[PDB]
Scaffold this active site. Structure first.
Site, mmCIF file in Angstrom:
data_model
loop_
_atom_site.group_PDB
_atom_site.id
_atom_site.type_symbol
_atom_site.label_atom_id
_atom_site.label_comp_id
_atom_site.label_asym_id
_atom_site.label_seq_id
_atom_site.Cartn_x
_atom_site.Cartn_y
_atom_site.Cartn_z
ATOM 1 C CE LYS A 136 -81.544 -43.470 34.226
ATOM 2 N NZ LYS A 136 -81.395 -42.272 34.499
ATOM 3 C CB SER A 183 -82.468 -40.284 26.047
ATOM 4 O OG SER A 183 -82.640 -39.002 26.769
ATOM 5 C CE1 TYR A 229 -85.898 -37.058 33.363
ATOM 6 C CE2 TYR A 229 -85.289 -36.967 31.029
ATOM 7 C CZ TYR A 229 -84.926 -37.156 32.424
ATOM 8 O OH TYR A 229 -83.641 -36.839 32.533
ATOM 9 C CG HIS A 289 -80.146 -37.677 36.669
ATOM 10 N ND1 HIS A 289 -81.460 -37.701 36.468
ATOM 11 C CD2 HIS A 289 -79.633 -37.353 35.358
ATOM 12 C CE1 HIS A 289 -81.708 -37.233 35.380
ATOM 13 N NE2 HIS A 289 -80.705 -36.971 34.740
ATOM 14 C CB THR A 301 -86.200 -40.393 35.086
ATOM 15 O OG1 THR A 301 -85.448 -41.534 33.988
ATOM 16 C CG2 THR A 301 -85.149 -39.787 35.856
HETATM 17 C C1 LIG Z 1 -74.686 -36.370 29.089
HETATM 18 C C2 LIG Z 1 -75.817 -37.338 30.010
HETATM 19 C C3 LIG Z 1 -77.072 -37.127 29.743
HETATM 20 C C4 LIG Z 1 -78.225 -37.897 30.503
HETATM 21 C C5 LIG Z 1 -77.706 -38.569 31.626
HETATM 22 C C6 LIG Z 1 -76.229 -38.540 31.928
HETATM 23 C C7 LIG Z 1 -75.423 -37.599 31.435
HETATM 24 C C8 LIG Z 1 -73.841 -37.830 31.741
HETATM 25 N N1 LIG Z 1 -78.801 -39.306 32.272
HETATM 26 C C9 LIG Z 1 -78.540 -40.204 33.586
HETATM 27 C C10 LIG Z 1 -77.697 -41.626 32.946
HETATM 28 O O1 LIG Z 1 -79.091 -42.488 32.581
HETATM 29 C C11 LIG Z 1 -77.208 -42.250 33.718
HETATM 30 O O2 LIG Z 1 -77.912 -42.313 35.319
HETATM 31 C C12 LIG Z 1 -75.534 -41.859 34.186
HETATM 32 O O3 LIG Z 1 -75.096 -41.327 33.107
HETATM 33 C C13 LIG Z 1 -74.977 -42.995 34.659
HETATM 34 O O4 LIG Z 1 -73.491 -42.580 35.369
HETATM 35 P P1 LIG Z 1 -72.260 -42.409 34.290
HETATM 36 O O5 LIG Z 1 -72.127 -41.655 33.223
HETATM 37 O O6 LIG Z 1 -71.946 -43.851 33.589
HETATM 38 O O7 LIG Z 1 -71.372 -42.148 35.412
HETATM 39 C C14 LIG Z 1 -79.865 -39.248 31.962
HETATM 40 N N2 LIG Z 1 -80.834 -39.968 32.483
HETATM 41 C C15 LIG Z 1 -82.455 -39.896 32.022
HETATM 42 O O8 LIG Z 1 -83.020 -40.638 32.643
HETATM 43 N N3 LIG Z 1 -82.450 -39.199 30.841
HETATM 44 C C16 LIG Z 1 -81.526 -38.510 30.264
HETATM 45 O O9 LIG Z 1 -82.014 -38.111 29.316
HETATM 46 C C17 LIG Z 1 -80.253 -38.656 30.519
HETATM 47 N N4 LIG Z 1 -79.294 -37.631 29.962
#
Ligand SMILES: Cc1cc2c(cc1C)N(C[C@H](O)[C@H](O)[C@H](O)COP(=O)(O)O)c1[nH]c(=O)[nH]c(=O)c1N2
Length: 344
Positions: A218, A105, A129, A242, A155
């Site tokens: 993404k 991340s 980002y 997301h 993203t």
């Molecule tokens: C707590 C938390 C924190 C983040 C995320 C999700 C969650 C639950 N996700 C989205 C992440 O990359 C991913 O798309 C999802 O978590 C996938 O779904 P599942 O949690 O496996 O159902 C996410 N995506 C991203 O591009 N940057 C980020 O900093 C984060 N941070």
């Protein structure tokens, strides 16, 4: 004690403070898509072949030309030190043990360099980002390059942060000792101050010129947008809502996957995240044309249990469930996981 991914979530709820568990658990608004990311997998049924000889099951594959031990990789989840003291360092160490990849991340509680140093042999990619500050953005890309990361996942679904109701109620913020180490809801306010709502396909052009690393878009949910990404010279699509945390009421990712696979006409790899909890979920996504899937929340629940060991346990459970699902389906390797295995 913990024998499936759902058990890890239940344990995490019992050990984490409510504000932290809710940050990790939550979806946007009424959480319709959050439920559907899981429910949708159950609607896709499996049609196994018998008597295919599955003594030697090979789970290995490749992501953007790099070998992995299984088509199951770690997705970007911010601020992992809230779950366990070792945070992203525990995660990368587990990925190295398993032979799979970690997407780091941009909002990590550990630096691009701290993570490369903890997992020098691990396959590592950076989730980017686009900050209003393009100089900050360039520095992150340049650090990824210097520190041996192998792709950029940009993203594209977050011009503003989604409205997660528990984070507003809890007034979510980091615990006092922690920071994002590469620099109402506190996170929504942060996004508003730092992240650029103006980004367009012209900014993708800029990013494509900035680095020779493979770039994956993404957060794409439409075939037209997937085709545009291919036209801009990007190298893959991560079909993602997301983790249901942005626009509520979009479809489940497993349901939009076939449209996206069709739209890109084999020109780039297509990945999936959102709702992957079981080996059969992975099998379904591959049958519909994904190269690999990413897991978000299950990794954080592994951390909350036992740090590095708890992440390794979660990844091992997914690997074994996937092996069994392949074998019971008649599949010796990932190359023979075909579209006739599933129907909606
Ligand atoms: C707590 C938390 C924190 C983040 C995320 C999700 C969650 C639950 N996700 C989205 C992440 O990359 C991913 O798309 C999802 O978590 C996938 O779904 P599942 O949690 O496996 O159902 C996410 N995506 C991203 O591009 N940057 C980020 O900093 C984060 N941070």
């Amino acid at each position: 004690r913990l024998i499936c991914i759902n058990d890890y979530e239940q344990h995490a709820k019992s050990v984490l403070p409510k504000s932290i568990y809710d940050y990790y658990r939550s979806g946007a608004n009424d959480e319709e898509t959050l439920a559907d990311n899981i429910a949708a997998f159950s609607r896709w049924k499996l049609y196994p072949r018998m008597l295919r000889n599955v003594a030697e099951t090979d789970l290995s594959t490749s992501v953007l030309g790099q070998r992995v031990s299984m088509p199951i990789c770690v997705g970007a989840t911010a601020m992992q030190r809230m779950a366990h003291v070792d945070g992203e360092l525990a995660t990368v160490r587990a990925c190295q043990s398993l032979g799979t990849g970690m997407m780091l991340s941009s909002w990590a509680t550990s630096s691009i360099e701290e993570v490369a140093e903890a997992g020098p042999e691990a396959l590592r990619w950076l989730q980017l980002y686009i900050y209003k500050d393009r100089e900050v953005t360039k520095k992150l890309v340049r650090q990824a390059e210097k520190m041996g990361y192998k792709a950029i996942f940009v993203t594209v679904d977050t011009p503003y942060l989604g409205n997660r109701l528990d984070d507003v109620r809890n007034r979510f913020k980091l615990p006092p000792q922690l920071r994002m180490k590469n620099f109402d809801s506190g996170l929504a306010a942060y996004v508003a101050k730092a992240i650029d709502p103006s980004i367009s396909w012209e900014d993708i052009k800029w990013l494509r010129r900035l680095t020779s690393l493979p770039i994956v878009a993404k957060g794409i949910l439409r075939g037209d947008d997937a085709r545009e990404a291919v036209k801009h010279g990007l190298n893959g699509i991560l079909v993602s809502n997301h983790g249901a945390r942005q626009l509520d009421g979009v479809p489940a990712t497993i349901d939009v996957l076939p449209e996206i696979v069709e739209a890109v006409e084999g020109k780039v790899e297509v990945f999936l995240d959102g709702g992957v909890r079981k080996g059969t979920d992975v099998l379904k996504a591959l049958a519909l044309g994904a190269k690999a899937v990413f897991v978000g929340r299950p990794i954080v629940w592994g951390l909350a249990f036992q740090g590095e060991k708890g992440v390794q346990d979660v990844l091992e459970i997914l690997k074994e469930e996937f092996r069994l699902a392949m074998a019971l389906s008649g599949c010796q390797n990932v190359k023979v996981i075909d579209k006739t295995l599933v129907r909606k």
